[PDB]
A paper describes a structure:
The impenetrable nature of the outer membrane is due to the presence of a large, amphipathic glycolipid called lipopolysaccharide (LPS) in its outer leaflet. Assembly of the outer membrane requires transport of LPS across a protein bridge that spans from the cytoplasmic membrane to the cell surface. Here, using structural, biochemical and genetic approaches, we show that these antibiotics trap a substrate-bound conformation of the LPS transporter that stalls this machine. The inhibitors accomplish this by recognizing a composite binding site made up of both the Lpt transporter and its LPS substrate.
We first solved a structure of LptB2FG in the presence of LPS and compound 1 to 3.0 Å resolution. Unexpectedly, compound 1 was found to form extensive contacts with both LptB2FG and a bound LPS molecule, which is a unique mode of inhibition. Because LptB2FG was heterologously expressed in Escherichia coli, the structure we obtained contained copurified E. coli LPS. The compound binding pocket is lined by side chains of several amino acids in the transmembrane (TM) helices of LptF (Glu58, Glu249, Trp271, Val314, Ile317, Arg320 and Thr321) and LptG (Leu36). The ternary complex structure also showed an extensive interface between LPS and 1. The LptB2FG–LPS–1 structure revealed that 1 protrudes into the gate formed between helix 5 of LptF and helix 1 of LptG, suggesting that its binding competes with the LptC TM helix for binding to the complex. The LptB2FG–LPS–1 structure suggested that 1 traps an intermediate state of the LPS-bound Lpt transporter. The drug pose observed in the ternary structures of A. baylyi LptB2FG in complex with E. coli LPS fully explained the resistance mutations that were isolated in Acinetobacter, indicating that contacts with LptFG are critical for drug recognition.
Residue numbers in the entry:
A (entry chain G): 4 to 137, 145 to 210, 218 to 355
B (entry chain B): 10 to 247
C (entry chain A): 10 to 248
D (entry chain F): 2 to 176, 185 to 195, 204 to 216, 223 to 235, 247 to 350
Amino acid sequence: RRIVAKHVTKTTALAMLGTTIVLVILQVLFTYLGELSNLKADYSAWQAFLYVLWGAPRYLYEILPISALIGAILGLGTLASNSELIVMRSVGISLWRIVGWVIRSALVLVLLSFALSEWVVPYTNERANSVKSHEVRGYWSREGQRFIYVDYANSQGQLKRIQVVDFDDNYRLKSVTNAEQGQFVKDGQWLLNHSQQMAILANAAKQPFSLALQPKYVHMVTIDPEDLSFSQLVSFMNYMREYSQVPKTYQLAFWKKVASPFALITLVLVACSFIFGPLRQQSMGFRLVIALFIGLGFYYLQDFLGYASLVYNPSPAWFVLGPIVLMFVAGSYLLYRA
Amino acid sequence: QTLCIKHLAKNYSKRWVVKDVSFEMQSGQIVGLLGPNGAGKTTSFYMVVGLVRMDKGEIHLDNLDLSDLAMHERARKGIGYLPQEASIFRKLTIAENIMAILETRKDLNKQQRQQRLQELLNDFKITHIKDSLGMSVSGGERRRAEIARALAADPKFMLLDEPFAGVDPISVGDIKDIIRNLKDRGIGVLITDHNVRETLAICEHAYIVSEGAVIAEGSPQDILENEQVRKVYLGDDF
Amino acid sequence: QTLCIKHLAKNYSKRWVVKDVSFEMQSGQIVGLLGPNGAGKTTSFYMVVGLVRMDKGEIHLDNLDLSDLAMHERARKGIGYLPQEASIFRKLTIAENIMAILETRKDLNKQQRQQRLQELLNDFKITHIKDSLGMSVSGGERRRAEIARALAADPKFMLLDEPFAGVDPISVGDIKDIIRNLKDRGIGVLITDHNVRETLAICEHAYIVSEGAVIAEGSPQDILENEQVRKVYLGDDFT
Amino acid sequence: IIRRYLVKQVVSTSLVVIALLTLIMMGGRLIKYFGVAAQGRLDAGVLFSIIGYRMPEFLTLILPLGFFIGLMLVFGRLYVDHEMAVLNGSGISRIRLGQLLIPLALVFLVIQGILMLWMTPWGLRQFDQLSSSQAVRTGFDLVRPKEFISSGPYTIYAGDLSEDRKNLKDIFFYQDVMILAKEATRNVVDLIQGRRYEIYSQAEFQRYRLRLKVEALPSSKLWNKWNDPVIASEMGWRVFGPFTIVIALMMAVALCEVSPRQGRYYRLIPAIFIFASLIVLLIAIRTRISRDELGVWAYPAALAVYGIAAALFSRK
Ligand SMILES: CN1C(=O)[C@H](CCCCN)NC(=O)[C@H](CCCN)NCc2cccnc2Sc2c(Cl)ccc(-c3ccc(N)nc3)c2CNC(=O)[C@@H]1Cc1c[nH]c2ccccc12
Ligand SMILES: CCCCCCCCCCCCO[C@@H]1O[C@H](CO)[C@@H](O[C@H]2O[C@H](CO)[C@@H](O)[C@H](O)[C@H]2O)[C@H](O)[C@H]1O
């Protein structure tokens, strides 16, 4: 079967893309209103429009889960209200096959979500921040049993006022070394000057020693764990895990990204099951209203359970994959009830 | 082929709308499922199709239990459904509507699918609109394309829902000719309709269901001369 | 009183659904506005009620133009509407359904409003079910409450939309008595209905609206003998 | 009977919408507040008091929005299930039905007049004192597990943290005095099995104790002093603000006509944006007067333009 599949996929795809265009345009206009109250002498209305316009790919990335939900509601709602889903079942097309055709439309949004996350959002985020405001300072890091503090760190391999403190398995001091400038030449060693090193008293004009800081991840320190792309996040987590402990705010960000495609498909399946179930024979406006309540309910639930994973002992995987598994099970049950 | 249906039952808001509705239908035979409005003729009809889940009952088709099957699992066994409302694929052409369901057939290859599509269009005289969108055709022309589309799935029992709905007396003969054509094609037809004057004119064996149960059975001649049907449904004069 | 309708017209999506429809209905006379489905009999009926805005023509009630008046302004002139679908106030008591419209009347005080409600309930044999909600009644009893409610507004012309819709042959005769009673009440009745066989059995003057224009006019006997109607609407075999 | 029928319907569905918007508008803020509390920047035990003190602030917006939405759902239902064809067909127009709800809108105007004039400042006054009390948190209060927190001259690293923000584990403290402890219970912090270093003085120990708006002013004080544009914008926002209920009445009557097949909720999203364009205009008017660019007379003018536009559209 191909003609039926194209009709169901194209109708839903145009509804998922049509909702995406509308939702991004509304969020750009709404964000611009909030950004219009921060104008000043050096930040004009045009400067505040580019900062919001450059943020559109990031608003786009966060709309795809809710535009796919509304898209499947409106895409299949048009088919359902026209009695087109009844005559697909009347010839032998199952409910799970019609859901599979809608998932094909959502798989375009999942691939679009990957492209924005990996290559588009991390770039326009850099451009957006440069529009408004126009290397990490006071960087505190731990490397196993050593605590390293650098006042100024640069992505090109420059340091200012380094301070490294060594400890034992019994937590006893060995050396508190301080420098004035530092340079990066190879992994696991940095060249530096004026090595005023304590010993449990010593000095050196120029000597390198071992430290695991790398300039590649310096620019990722200030970036929030949520904002980091998956390529940046996993590489950064692998770097921290090799020398220290990864914070739970990075574990949550990792799980909130690996479960992003699975929350888009699951939320589509819930939309399809509602069309065949509770939202059958309802008005198009009522389906859109309910599709907005599920979107907010899912956004609030994933926001709250994200925060709850940073305050409670269990791993963030339980809180992130919790609703996704339950909505899939509950959504697949509403499909079993036909 | 015989579609045995035994002891149907269904409740809504803790009220049994259908109570022990049982009737038998054979292939190549028109059977009218009639009765007072809201007395269970529509609900008993939908439980045969599969829209309404069966609380109690047994549906058999050639020693083959369709009771547990869903709407689509029955449709693959040879049960068709023609909705009363407009059910044409709006954005697909009339030829694409029939071709959409013809590709579902497994025992047809691409060579004979086009031949089957051509004769289905010629049978119902919708060739002149084969390239027009399903949303831009006349109600009489669209309904012929919905029946032609339903016949693309090769059904053994076509369950028509309200065929004489909004049909003028001039074109009531056209619908009867279509329904008579389905019988001559070897397809049993189950008709539920509010228009009982014309449904009792093509059906060979009618079932009158009142108060949720079958109160009469037989040919339209026997239905008319039935005291319970005359008292409850048809009235003294008819 | 004579409701006069002249040269109705209405175009939908640049297609003239109604083209020069004109008919006259008097008080105490039942007029059936019939015709092929989708030929403009439904749209022409709505322009008389006021649901759809007129696009050409005029409506008169004893040299009192009603074309420019909205639906509610014609109702105060004595024109009623009975929707085919369930139009009862769902969460109001049946006694309150009739009473909600009786309190609208200005020429009735509390003393004679309860008297009118009591006789309206008795005239339609719903006084036994007068304490139940509008949405918790039988289909036959609900319509009797919608006609009692309509009479509470004291109309001079009642425009019935599909009175014989979803009605069993046992209960078709019950509606015939209701419509006959409305005529016996001095109220003209305009009926549009797909069930032409039963609509022609009560109306004394039927109008057949085909291709957007009135093609027939007169008693049901004259409509049946019309060769133009039997070619487009009724067919060769009809009685 | 027809007025009591409508008031019961509008009040019932407006309270549902108001309770539905309160759960959504402040459920989102409560979750956001919980996000701040999860990072130690706000006490987890007071974030329910913040929601209590922001009830009048959000209900200032929800009440006109709940009344507007509840009005169109009721008037949409009358159109959808043909109760308006028999009300118009009996001589009662839609404008007449909206005029039967003026006594109800006056009650909602009085209710919101209480919110805008009294509880919105009172709620914001207590919230401002409370929020400023949470901005002084520093030191071990802002600590996070497996992370370095710097607050002034203090740098604190904790290897683990309980579900409550007590009983720290693997504590590192830096000024220059460096303190490392295995356990710490909480500024007053009791350190257990720790080492103290001075940067060269070393002192091991078993236990250690470480000791490291015009929007809320009362309306009484704002009744006078109309000369100042900042007070002029705020006091005008409190006096002409409650009259959005009346505008939400005659604009919900205008934008409620909907077909039975279209649905009760068909005209919600298109018409919530028409209502929201009024509020966005009124927020854009409150700021200009605050900079002394527009004048206080523009509050009724914004309402009158929407009032006249709604009245003209309902009578077309
Ligand atoms: C800067 N403002 C605030 O501080 C209010 C105060 C919150 C309620 C306090 N009780 N918060 C916010 O903006 C937070 C984000 C800020 C995070 N700190 N969320 C958004 C928001 C909420 C509430 C109202 N509008 C808005 S967004 C807005 C809108 Cl919808 C429409 C127009 C404008 C605007 C006006 C003039 C101008 N040239 N460009 C733009 C804005 C910008 N917003 C503003 O101008 C307002 C002005 C204002 C001060 N007191 C008010 C009391 C009621 C209504 C408005 C105000
Ligand atoms: C259903 C909707 C009906 C129509 C509603 C139209 C109005 C919608 C509300 C507009 C809300 C504006 O939302 C507002 O977005 C701005 C972004 O500029 C956020 O602003 C926040 O982040 C920006 C940059 O990210 C900072 O410059 C700013 O200082 C900070 O407050 C506000 O915290 C938020 O309140």
